[PDB]
């Protein structure tokens, strides 16, 4: 697979790991859109608003299978590492408008 999952469940922006490298999701937009990262960071989405939005890669993005993650309440983050270089798309499941990338170099 090219990701692995810390914490299968969101856990509270206030538990988000030291030096953790964060993408804030507030006013219906991933706030930084296009993230460039290293293979082997964790990358940490944190949503800022009441209403709930995931992260999700379709099948053949990050594994076989779609990678579809849990909603996130208001102040609750997820993670990914990533494992693999290349480019990953990634959309809101609720809110498909909501569009982001991440390229591992
Ligand atoms: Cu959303």
Same mark, same amino acid.
């Given at each position: 697979?090219?990701?692995?999952?810390?914490? %299968?469940?969101?856990?509270?922006? @206030? %538990?988000?790991? $030291?030096?953790?490298?964060?993408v $804030?999701?507030?006013?219906?937009?991933?706030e930084?859109? =296009?993230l460039?990262?290293? #293979?082997?960071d964790? #990358?940490?989405?944190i949503?800022?608003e009441?209403?709930?939005?995931?992260?999700?890669?379709?099948?053949?993005?990050?594994? =076989?299978?779609?990678?579809?993650?849990?909603?996130?309440?208001? %102040?609750?983050?997820?993670?990914?590492?990533?494992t =693999? @270089?290349?480019?990953?798309?990634?959309?809101?499941?609720?809110?498909?408008?909501?569009?982001?990338?991440?390229?591992? %170099?």
């Amino acid at each position: 697979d090219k990701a692995t999952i810390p914490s %299968e469940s969101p856990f509270a922006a @206030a %538990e988000v790991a $030291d030096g953790a490298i964060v993408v $804030d999701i507030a006013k219906m937009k991933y706030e930084t859109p =296009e993230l460039h990262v290293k #293979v082997g960071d964790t #990358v940490t989405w944190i949503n800022r608003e009441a209403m709930p939005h995931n992260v999700h890669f379709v099948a053949g993005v990050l594994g =076989e299978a779609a990678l579809k993650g849990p909603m996130m309440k208001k %102040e609750q983050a997820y993670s990914l590492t990533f494992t =693999e @270089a290349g480019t990953y798309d990634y959309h809101c499941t609720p809110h498909p408008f909501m569009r982001g990338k991440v390229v591992v %170099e």
